[model samples]
Target: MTAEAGITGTWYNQLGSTLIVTAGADGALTGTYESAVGNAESSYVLTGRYDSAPATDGSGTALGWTVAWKNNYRNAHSASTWSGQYVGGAEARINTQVLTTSGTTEANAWKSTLVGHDTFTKVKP
Candidate 1:
């Protein structure tokens, strides 16, 4: 009963997207994402860093992660970054904001830097 409530578990989003996170004591993060927006054949590796434990005023900590999706659109690549706060007490969730860029190497970058929201819950907690 002495462990800090950390972000090291299976989390699920609204669209049934799955995010599995593994964090170290030094705030190093590594995980996998079975995306809901891209190819479902395999999961993607995520790398990022997590901030310290819970802060004041009902916030746990802040963390960010990125994933370079494979075959996001039939052999094309997409990169997405998610920044969120890990709220532990009230309702354990990673309330996130995301921006995904679908190979922003050309014009008409509409879908590039696309924004969205994802509040991940530790369902199988």
Candidate 2:
């Protein structure tokens, strides 16, 4: 999964969002994330990295990404992240759990760190 040429391309989420990544030889990733979470149809910058070594079983290639909201004034503390493994072998996919803030201040800042089960498909690898 570390710059093998298959992991650095366009991908899609189950909710119809899009991701396009370019991974470096050192596993550093840079990309764009077009989110489908709301009707606003927003896009954000994505940055992440992966483990250079995979698990012996070939499942836990740990990787994660982050995207901050520039247009979200509702949640002033807003930003989201997806962290998990790049699994599925030949038909590669990112099976991750999400964490996003939903409120303004830390006192009233509600967030969901258990926004789990987002499977991202490798659409253009």
Candidate 3:
């Protein structure tokens, strides 16, 4: 499934309502993740690209986009990446993020073994 060229929007995480992202840059992947998981959410501005296109009917049949997110907060920062795919109309964008760090502080950051999915839609500029 290929994303609609203008698939720019905002999504809210269902977890703590702390995570939110805004799509921008002519379909380019760019947004913010607001959450305490890594506590880096405050400063973590996801900058990546869609490895694949997003599904239209919500069917995760064809893997959608892949994003490379980098966590930047103070001097303590790390690089984390994830991929976004369709969910067959779950009203959410499914994704998985990988943390490239160690230690409890970093490990405990986001122990979620599950994929990252959020309910978002296009926001008219």
Candidate 4:
């Protein structure tokens, strides 16, 4: 497929964080994120977008994003790299590494937090 191909779909990891992506014809991407199940310390919705050049080095495509979530008492931001590819033409495998800013918006307790690596499978409807 060309670099302009869309990867639009609903994707989720084993931890229950679901991502819903919509890719435009020009390769512009928009997506929404839901917090993991039972990890709801903050009541906020996460969102992200992709505007980088598609990678073509046989490592598939790697897209970068800045994600954020906020509520009245909580705020967090993250930088993530999403690497994706179709799995033998049947499913898509998306792996992510997110560096989250630690603590709430009210503290100096900031640090680069790479909590864990997650792999999301694209769910076919």
Off by over 4 Å in 3: 5-7, 17-27, 39-41, 51-73, 88-90, 102-125
Model 4 ranges with Cα > 4 A deviation: 2-6, 37-58, 71-88, 103-112
Q: What ordering of candidates by lDDT runs from best to worst?
A: 1, 2, 4, 3
lDDT of 1 by residue, 1-125 (tens): 10134588888988888999887777788888886763344588888988754456654588899988763434446788899878775467889998887876567676577788888887832
The candidate with the higher TM-score, 2 or 4, is 2
User: What's the lDDT for candidate 2?
Assistant: 0.69
Residue 14 displacement in candidate 4 (angstroms): 1.5
Residue-level lDDT of model 4, residues 12-96, one tens digit each, is 7878777766656654667666668323333334444443345555555555444455556544443344434433135566666
lDDT of 3 by residue, 1-125 (tens): 23533334444444543333433333456666555454343545665554344445534522223222344435343444545543423343544444344223655757533344343322211
Candidate 3 displacement at residue 91 in angstroms: 2.5
TM-score of each model, in listed order: 0.81, 0.77, 0.48, 0.61
Q: Which candidate is the best by lDDT?
A: 1
For model 1 the local lDDT of residue 62 reads: 86
Clashes of each: 1, 0, 6, 0
Worst 10-residue stretch by lDDT in candidate 1?
1-10
Clashing pairs in 3: 3-54, 18-34, 58-88, 58-89, 59-88, 95-116
